[PDB]
Structure formats: structure tokens, C-alpha cells
């Protein structure tokens, strides 16, 4: 017996009782239903409201249909798809803009055809697996086109039409099996060189500069004459080079792309928002790819056409995911010969690609090459210290380390900007090892592999060399000069060095651990194996010395400066005078200041982000710079007051003058003279701050029934709770590992420093440090000299062998 | 002219071109539409599929309708509500269970009535603001009822029916204006005492124990005889007390409530999942409240009925939000006299509520009272050290600090478990200051107020005392013994102490800062103001001494033990012998071990969660315990070998024996004898570990068109980005503040310790420390004696004044 609940939701508050077990009489319920008439009025209103549909409602219905289809439910998907198709077909007539009307009509027809196909599939007439809407790319004219632009030759269809398609491929390896194709493959052009330009949250200026530089490089490649020994022959000839180069611009997400970048892309005819919004309504795209052959004009000069594929991912993911998409999908489809990788903003020079291709074609044994990296505008604004210090560091590191590692044909790390590979030695196992993280959950991999974040470049570099049944060796080219941009403040430098140091240390540990695979599996010449053994010994020694760097720096400064001041060993002044208070006060002040600075640095670095702590980092850097400048002045005075000796001059040469010798040999001597003073004032800051902060933030890393409803809710809740627990456990493990590593490092350094201070004197420790430093710098100088000899000789002596 | 796109979504890959500006001819489009016939087949399938609706689909449609209604869109809300109502009305007939059928029929009728009301409102016939579905509470019989249970008297309707209603109130202050009511108010009973039992992720055993203890307390209150001077008179008499007590059980979220707790609640008839799922389909409830008068039986004895309101919040929020809901909604509606707050698991004793009510009624000036807190089963399992140490700390803290602060009538912090207030001094401004965080975004409040997390109890305690135009003083009752449960391991203790120490320190700073309001605004007696001044001076001195505790502990241990060993000042052994190596080796070992331990502790505490670092914390605690035990043994030997003096014995008494004197005065002497040895072995661990880890993790804290669509998307993205930036900025500010505070604390301690070590000797520093400690302990002992005198005298001397 139903109570008086005729007005229960209408009134503000209503109380009722619902007995259980009576089940009610149906006649009373029907009488209650028939006694209410107002409902019809509401019904009429709804029937009046639903007559005219709306674009937004149709898009929402299509989105719901796509979500349901991705959820393994088809009947609701079919109903929603039919409703959306009919709604869009009705709506298309009302719109006034011809573009919008045409796009809506095409989308409606496509949706109706997909509905028919799915209905046929449900009946079992068509046998497929995981049915999806058919691929339907759309070509539209460009809004803005330059009437006055003279190029080699451009078909009207290629020149004035930009193509678009959304993709659904969840595993990019299947990008070609699902039936997707590009304009280049369809047209018959077969590019040989592919360049990937990753982009995420970047202003239009950097992209414009990169595209202009690429066009200039292509023009220079075109303009070279034939018949010369240094001229490339083959598909890279003149007047036809622009058809053999393809540029993939892989963005990282609509949510983070700078709006001005989107405006610039729309200006050059590569991104139209209306087409993206309309065509991708119900597909549920992982990415959207636009294709064009863009033409760029700067000032009064016209550049060469560039074939461009712009891929925009719906979600956000790391750069490794962008490389995954690029390499797997596009490389597997087009199958090029040389694959080049660079970041946005890397402004090349005229003669970079020519040198790279020349080296690749002539040598035939190079499994990967990298160019020299330099800072844009080093001389300009010489007042700033950080830019000059970074310029000096880039020059010295490039010359010495790259030369030495290229002599043995094993580059430790190719720069993430402007690197190149040949797509024959990285197709199989090396790429699989490159993308090991993206295919396996980090719980299975463990902490060691997981912590190798922003370091996979070294993984690929090692895998190319140690590939089984092959002998691929990396190489370094001097002339491939690429100009980047560096942070102008301390905080950005700190963050960048954090990433670089973490990746470098863990990749180096992995390489040292797995070096044996070269002898076990690879097929190299015996001389190559011996050279690799020598380089392995050198690498072990250098890593061991670099792991104990802060203690060595502290000991050197302390001993030399202060125990020459206190124990009267400075040669330009006698300190046997004074009241014995200053002599100990200097040492106490130095020790207390150093310890307090280190404590403050470690607390701040482990604690919070280094962006709001600008003043403290500036203060610590200034203190350390003053200390290092004072120590350098005292050392210079000591050296210039000593009557000099053969041992002394040999040590001084092999310790300090190796930089000047190498720079004069390679002709880059003026930069060193300009920037050595600036670099000398940041060495302790570099070592301490960067290493400590890198090791501190290592944690940072990526038609049922009621019973069915209840069971579904319980299962979903249980699964969510289990997933949350697993994520928490993984984070706990990574934090524990990073804490253990940091404790080991800090305590090893402290114990070593204390033992050396308490159980050794200056006359018994400094010779060992001098010998170690002299040995390392002598090895590096020999490597640089060997590389220069090779680069200036092998061209002429290639005729002999 | 439309291209051949008849088969575009059907095929795997289709290429087409869509010109812009032509707008297409409608005749060709219509001819293309009329040339396709297969669509009808699909249509038929949909018409066949949509005939039979489903419960889950109806619930999903209602949920979408509620979401749309909350989104200020009414037409779509009206359509979805009508569709869901019709679907549920059709579905209700098919179900077999009478309960499900009745609930579905009632929900369908309610939905249809709400649809009619909303349709009338849209036409403007009814004038309202923010229309919402009408409140409709449902009473259902309990599944399990005890046939054999003899109580005082129970109406059939009250005994055998449980009531339920979902609420929508976004601002709980409006809980009574929206028209919601409780069973107690409707029935005519007017409770006077309200008890809130917060719950979040707790096992059934704790809740069962708490309910059993509450029933025992009510029975003891009932059984007391009248006509006695110590017997309460009024609404708390016998045979009718159970009607004047209401218990609010406020959960914290369905996602985190332990399933066994839900099963237990369903067992005693307070939670039915089917009713919750069905009735709350379209309201969009912030909380769901069930009401019952539950009867509990344990073993062969039957307890007294308890009026219970169980409120379950849909989302998760802090305990402060639960108190907000409880206080505002229920206190404003019922308007009780005394409000009691306790946590789940607080097992009371028989004579707790009686003592609390007796004190409140007799004194008439107490604006809030708190009971003594103790550990359950202290003697059992005496092998464990942590439980005994916590028991000793609870006893000593309670006795001394509570007695001294109750003498001046200002308790620093009432325990979060088993506290009480009178609902006349907290109704206005004090509650507004209590809930300042929940009504104002933390950006406006700033870092200082925001960092006062888990400390609002002290805020309320201070606001009650310093209320304008009133004189309310807090009070402490000795006999209100409540037994809690304490963590058995070091890690849980560490986390709990982290929370407590953070809250305590920042609340203490706030109180010291704003103490002037008592003199400025409050209306107290002059003698009260003088007493508050004396207590303020004592509080300042104690806080100042406690801020420099680690340095004082280190100095005391170092000086006494090691500089008695090295400089031959231990009185039971002469160290003028030995080869001068041990004498300095002891000091060096002590200093190095202490510094390394502190460094490890601070790095670990700042670094990661203290749950996977169990071994390191155990090791550090063991080292510090061994050190403290050795120091205690050496000190005892020194004291017992000295020929003794009046000054020495006075210092020893006023330093150590104050604990024993106070415990013997209050009769709790056996616990101190049992647990003093265990507590002595954790003092350095307590101080260092708890303070450092508390200060390390301070960061932890809580029908449009296409152009309209594009503008909507852009606006939503911009708003989301702005919100993300604001959240990041707030987190940056809080991290910076906590880092600055930690640096200040650590560097102050280190500088003080170094200065005292280098510029002072044992004979020039220890007397000051002895004087300070003796003064503080003498003041505390005098406070305890005064409190005991008051508690044993005022009862007899109340006749005089
Ligand atoms: C730590 C050590 O032993 N030696 C230092 C070198 O590690 C360091 O070389 C730099 O290595 C990193 C590793 O990748 C390179 O980072 C890449 O940089 C490019 C261009 O700047 C960027 O596009 C990439 O994203 C980035 N890779 C990432 C983030 O994974 C960096 O280019 C190397 N620098 C050079 C000149 O090659 C050098 C650099 O100062 O210092 C040694 O001390
Ligand atoms: C740090 C200092 O100067 N003195 C210490 C006191 O702060 C501490 O007293 C404790 O204060 C906290 C503050 O609230 C109380 O925490 C509450 O505890 C109850 C029951 O355990 C719990 O229900 C509450 O949730 C919790 N409040 C929160 C989390 O905000 C604690 O009860 C107080 N302890 C006592 C016995 O009253 C004492 C305790 O050892 O130590 C002083 O050194
Ligand atoms: O989430 C991200 C962040 C960055 N990047 C790219 O990775 C590189 C980051 O380089 P970094 O900022 O270290 O140095 P930069 O060369 O940009 O100054 C750039 O090419 C970015 O576009 C990316 O693909 N995804
Ligand atoms: O998100 C939360 C976490 C805890 N609590 C309650 O707050 C108190 C936390 O007490 P704590 O864990 O510090 O000590 P306990 O007394 O529980 O051992 C308990 O009453 C919990 O039920 C809560 O309401 N919400
Ligand atoms: Mn860059
Ligand atoms: Mn508890």
C-alpha cells in the first residue's frame, strides 16, 4: 500500500515510510499513475526543447560514444553514434560558414557509414578484431598563401593543400598495419634523411630560427657543384635535394603548447583548430598529424620548400615517448637511411649537414655521429659570469673529452641536440633497449634501471657499439657547429645540471657494469678490443677520481693556502711573526665557514625547489667564488716567487697549461683567454652545489541487474585501492634507494677527508694528487693530439689504405 | 560537390578532399542521403535494443542529470531527469525483491514530482533561489532485530525502524534553513548532552569497545540514588537519562572506511547499502545521515538504548571538517548545553561522565574541561620499552603540567580525546576562530596561520578564555580517566610526535603573540589578571628553555661525563694515570659519534618517509639509549661517592625527586617506579629525533554555436592553468617558510653550543643549568601541590565561600 507521496519531491520536506516484504499491489500503483496529469505538460516542454539540436550537444554525444566504445560496450556505442550522426546531419544545414557546413556534412556521413559498418559487424557478417572507425584523412586549402614566392617547382595540389588525420594506434609499432599512410609515401617521393624536432612549451622565435637555419642548410647543400672530390654524390645532389629531406615536428600536448606557437603554426599553414575540433569528434585520437610542404620567406629572400609532418599528442609524456613515436612509426614506415635528432632552438650553421653526410658516406663504419655544441653570443654581454663559464666548459669538454673518446671510437654521450645515426645499426635490439622503460612497468625493472632518468642517450650509444654480430663505432665531427641557448641565471643552470648529473652518473655506472658484453658478444678487430681495454682502464680511473672530487678540492685548498699561511710556507711572505692568534684563527674561520656552507647547501637542496631560494644560493656562490679567487691569487704568488725547477715547471705545464696547448692546437684560444678567469671563480660552486643538489632530488620521477551493479562498484573500488597501494610502494622503494646512495656518497667523502687530515701532512699528500692530476691531463692531451692528427691526416692518407 | 565518400568510415583507409568556400549544393547532399538504405537496419537494431531499460543505465542517467543541474544548466537537467524517472518507473516492475521494487517505485515517483516542480519553476510560476529536489527521508525496518532484549520502554516505530536521508547543504550553517530535521527533534525529545565520535579507517573492535563503555557510563549515571549531596539533579536523573544523550558518529568517506566496520554497522542496524545506492541517485549528496535508537547486548547482559546519528561524508576531509559539520549543523539545530568530543577507541571508565557533569554543574565558571589520559594495559608486556616510556610521559605530563595550568585556570591544550565544553561560551566568536581555515583560502591567511596544522584545539582553548565581555576559565578533572591505545613501534610514535610537536610549537607561538587580548578585551577579576601575568612569565621562561634543549643536553652529558673522565674529576676513580691517548680518545669518539648520528638523523628525516628506514632509526635509538644509560650510571656513581652537602642534596631533590614527590602525593607512585628506568633510556632519542623530524616535514599540508564552443574551451584551459600556477606558488611559499624556520633553529643551537664549549668551563656553566632546572621543577611542584590542596579542600570549604 503506497502512502500519500503524491507531493514528496515538490514540497521542501516530506516524511514517508516504505514497508518491505509487502511488494505493493500493482492496481494501486497504476491508479496512482493514472491520477497524475501534470507530467504531460513537462513532456510537451521536452518535446519542444529537443526539436532543435546544437553543435556542442552533438560533440558531447560523440565523445560519450567514443568513450563507451573504448570501454568494450557496443550497443550503447551504436545508439550514441547513430544519435550523434543524425544530430550532426540535421545541424549541418543551419551553419553559415561554408567550411563549417562542409566539414559537418562530411563528419555526419562518415559517422553514419561507421554506424552501418558496426551494425553489420554486430550481426557477425564481417569478421574483424577490435573494430574501429575507418581512417579518413581530409585535405583543405590553406587560409594564407604567398602569391609572390618563386620556388623550383610546386604542383598546385601539393602547394595549396594541407592534409590532416587523427590516429588511434595505441602501440606505435602497429602504425602501418592499421592502414595509416603519409603524403610523402602516397606521392611517390622516398625521403632518405629524417629530422625530428621535439617541442614543448616554446616560443615562436626559437622554432622560426630553427626552420630558417634548416632552410639555409638545404640551400647550401643544393648550391654545391659536382665533379669535386669533396662533393657528395647520389640523392643529395643539387636542384633535387629538397625532396629527400623530411622534418617531423613532434609536439607534447595541447594543454602546454604556448598559444603564440599555435598562432605561428596557423600562420604558415600547419594547424587549423576548427578542422581538429570537428574531424576528431568520435575517433578518440591519441595524436593528430598534419602534413604539408611548407614554404618560408624571410625579409626579401625566399627559402626552399620543406616537407613537414607535425604530430600533436593529445596527452603529455616525456621526450622519450616522442622519440618512441617518431622512431617506431615513421622510421618503420618510410625506412630511411640516416636519422637526425635535435631539440627546438638548436640553430645550426651553413656547413653542418654537409659535413655530417660527408663523414657518414666516406667512412662507412660510423654507427652514429655528433656535432660540436656552442653557446650563442658568448662575447656579447661579457659582464655576466654564468654564460662565460658555461661557454668555457662547453669548449673544454668538447675538445678534450670528445677528441679522446673519438680516438677510441666510443663517445660516452652524444648531445641530445644535433645527433645523428644510420638507420641500419639501431633498427633491432638497440632501439628495444632504448625504449625498455616505456614497455615495462618500473616495478619489474627495479630501482637501478628506473633511476636512469634522462640518460637513455648513453644507453643507445653503448648499444650501438656493443651490438652482436656487428662492428659499429661512434665518431665525432669537429665542424658540425650547433649554437644553443643557455640559462642566464644560477637557478636554471642548477636545475639543468641536476638532470644532467643524475643521468650521467647512473648511465656511467651501467656502462661500467655491462662493458663485458663488447668482448663477449661483439665481433670487433683484436686491435679494437685492446684499444677498448685501454679506454676502459682510463674510464675506471677517471670515474674513481671524480667520485672523490669534493674532498680532494677541500684538501688541496686547505693544505696549500692555510697550512702555508699558518706553518710559514708561503714563499712571498714570512709568517713566523704574529701573536699565534691569527695563525689558528684563519684555519678555524675557513673550517667553520666551509662546514656551515655545506650544511646550508645540503639542507636547502634536499628541502625545497631551488627557485625561491635565489638569495641563499647567490650568497653561497659568492662566498665560494671569493674563496677560490683568493686561493688562486695565493697559488699564483707562490708559483711566481719560487725560483722554479724542472719538476715544478713540468707539473705546472701538465696541470694547467694543457688547456691552453689544446686550444692553441685547435685554434680556439681566444675564448679560453676570455673565459678562464670567469670559469675559475665557479669551480667549488659547480662541484659542491651541482653534485649535492643532483643527488638530493633523485626522487623526482614519472543491461544488468542490481547485484551486478553492486559487484561492479565493489570490484572497481578494490582495484583502485590496490593500484594506489602499488604506486605508494614503488615510490617508497625509489626514495629508499636514493637516500641510501646519498648517505653512502656523503659519508665516504667525509671519512676520507677526516682520515687524510688527521693521518697525513702536506709533504706526504700533495705529490700523490699532483701525480694523479698530471697523469689524467697528460692522457687527455695525448688523446686530443691524436684526434687532431687523424682529422688532418686521414683525408690525405686514405689513398694508401 | 561532395566526393565519393559513400564508403569512407567502412574501409580501413580512405582519402578525400573537402574544398572550402563552395558550400556544396543541397540537392546533391539530399540525393546522397536518399541513396543510402542500410542505415534503417541499424536504426531497427537500436529500436530493438532501447525497448528494455536497465537499473545501471537509469542510475547513470540520474547521475548525469544531477551533475548537469549542479552545472547551472536546467533544460538538459530537465530532460535527463524525466528520462531517468520514466526509466526507473518502467524498471520497478521487473524486480523480484519487494524492498528493491518499493524503493525503485518511490524514487521514480519522487523524481517525477521533482520534474513537475522544476518545469513549473522554469515557467516562472514559482519564485525560488537555487531550486533543488525536495528532502525525502525514508524509514525502513531493520534486517536483524533482537527478540530477547528487555529495555526501559521502546515504542515499536522507534525500536524497529531506522531512518535515512541524504543532505545537500554546501555550507553546514544552513543545515536548518534548507528544511532538514532529525528524528530526535521530531519526536519531541530534547537532548542536553551531545557526544561526537570521529572515525576514519578503524576496525570494528575499537568502535564496539567505545560503544560498550558509553553504555556502561549511561547505566552508571542511571543507577545513582537521589537525595545525596554528591548526586546530580535535573535532566540527568535515573530511569530517564538515556533520552538526554545523543551520539553523533561522523565518518570520513566511503572510499577509506574499513569494510568490516561497514559490516558491523549493518549488523547493529545503522547502514544499508541498497537504500543508500537507490535513494541518493540524483540528489548529489555531500553527506548521508542515518538515525536510529540502537540497543546493544554483550554476552548475557543487555545495555541501555543509545540515540545515534551516523553521518557519512561522500568525500574525504580533515577532522576539522568533521568537527565543522558536527558543531555547526547539529549544535545549531538541537542547541544543547554541554558538548563532548572524543576520538574512536577512547575507552572510558564507569565514573567519567558523572565527574565531568558534576564539575560543570557545581563550578558554573568552567568554560571547558578535559580528563586524564592513560595507556591501556601498561603493566602487561613489560618487555616492550616504548609503551612504558609513553605511559611514564603521559603520567608525568598530566600530573605536573595539567595541575599547574589548572591552578591558574588556563589549560594549554585539552586532549583531542575526551574533552568537553559548555555550549554557551563557544557559540559565537570562538567557533568562528576555530574554523578560520575552512572558510578562507590559505593564500589569504598566510604561512603562519596555515602552518598551524593539527593545532586548532589550542586555538579554541585560548579563544574560550579570552572571549570579550565574558570570564570563562578552563579546568582539569582528575578522575575522568580515559584509556587510549598507543603505537607499539618506533615509527608510529615518530609520526604521531611529528604531528603533535608541529602543532604544539606553532600554537604556542600564536598564544604568546596574542596573549595581550586577555588584558585588552576580556573582563576578568584583577587577581585573575595578576595570576595570568605570573603564568605568562612562567610560560615564556619554559618555552625559551625548551627551544634550546638539544644544546643543553649535549653540553650536560659532554661536560659531566667526559670532562670528568678526561680531567680527572670522577670521584670514584682516579684518571691521572693512562698514556694521554685514552683521555682525548674518549672525547673525540663521543664528539664524532654524536655529530655523525645527528647528520644521519637530519638527512633521513628531511629525505623520506620514516617507515622503510626502520633499521637506521632503531640503530640510532639504540646508540643514544646506550649513551644515556652510561651517563646515568656515571652520574649515580658520582653522586653516591660524594660525601654529600646541603647544596648537593637540595639540588638533587629539586632536580630529580620532584617526580617521586608528586607521584606519591597523588598516589601514582608504582607506575613511576616501574617506568622511570625505561623512560631514562629514550630522552636523547625523544628530543633529537622527534624535534628534528617534526621540523623537517613541516611542508606536509592539505544550445550554442561553434564560436561559443571554442571560447568555452579556451576559457576553461586558461582558468585551469591559472589555478595550477596559484597552487604551485602557495606550495613554494610554505616550503620556503619551513626551510627558513628549520635553518634558524639548527644554526641557533649550533652557535650556542660552540660558544659555550669554546668560551666556558665546567665550573662556570653547570651552576647556571642547575639553577634553571631547579627553578622550573620547583615551580611545577608548587603548582601540583596547590592543585591537590584545591581539589581536596574546595569541596569542604565551599560552604564558607
Ligand atoms: C657528469 C660528467 O661526468 N661529465 C659531464 C657531462 O655529462 C656533460 O655532458 C653533457 O651530457 C648531457 C647528457 O645528455 C647532455 O645533455 C643533453 O644536452 C642536450 C643539449 O644541451 C639536450 O638537448 C639534451 O636534452 C640533454 N640530454 C638530456 C636532458 O637527457 C649534454 O649535452 C652534454 N654536454 C655536452 C657539451 O655534450 C658535460 C657538459 O658540461 O659536463 C661534463 O662535466
Ligand atoms: C610540545 C610541548 O611543549 N609539550 C608536549 C605536549 O604537546 C603533549 O601534549 C599533547 O598535545 C597534543 C596536542 O593536541 C595532544 O594531541 C591530541 O591527542 C589526542 C589523544 O591522544 C588525540 O585524540 C588528538 O587527535 C591529538 N590532537 C591532534 C592530533 O591535533 C595530546 O593528547 C597531548 N598529550 C596529553 C597527555 O595531553 C605532551 C604529550 O606527551 O607532551 C609534551 O611534551
Ligand atoms: O616534458 C618535456 C620537457 C621538455 N621536452 C624537450 O626536451 C628538451 C629539454 O631540454 P632542456 O630544457 O634540458 O635544455 P634546453 O636545450 O631546452 O635549453 C627540449 O627539447 C624540450 O622541448 C620534452 O619533449 N618534454
Ligand atoms: O583523515 C583523517 C585521519 C584521522 N582522523 C581521526 O583523527 C584521529 C587521529 O588520531 P591519531 O591517529 O593521531 O591517534 P590515535 O588516537 O588515533 O591513536 C582519530 O580519531 C581519527 O579517526 C580523521 O578524522 N581523519
Ligand atoms: Mn633549449
Ligand atoms: Mn587512536
Author numbering:
A (entry chain B), B (entry chain A): 40 to 741, 762 to 860
What does the paper say about this structure?
(GlcNAc)3 is trapped within the chitin-translocating channel through a series of interactions, including hydrogen bonds and hydrophobic interactions. The newly added GlcNAc moiety extends outside the channel, representing a pre-translocation state. Unlike the apo structure, however, an approximately 7 Å retraction of the VLPGA loop (452–458) and an approximately 100° flip of the side chain of Pro454 are observed in the UDP/(GlcNAc)3-bound structure. In the UDP/(GlcNAc)3-bound structure, the Mn2+ ion forms coordinate bonds with the β-phosphate group of the leaving group UDP with a bond length of 2.2–2.3 Å, which is consistent with the range of coordinate bonds between a first transition metal and a nitrogen-containing or oxygen-containing compound. Our PsChs1 structures revealed that the entrance to this channel is blocked by the swinging loop, specifically residue Pro454, in the apo and substrate-bound states, but it is open in the (GlcNAc)3-bound state.
They represent the apo, GlcNAc-bound, nascent chitin oligomer-bound, UDP-bound (post-synthesis) and chitin synthase inhibitor nikkomycin Z-bound states of the enzyme, providing detailed views into the multiple steps of chitin biosynthesis and its competitive inhibition. The structures reveal the chitin synthesis reaction chamber that has the substrate-binding site, the catalytic centre and the entrance to the polymer-translocating channel that allows the product polymer to be discharged.
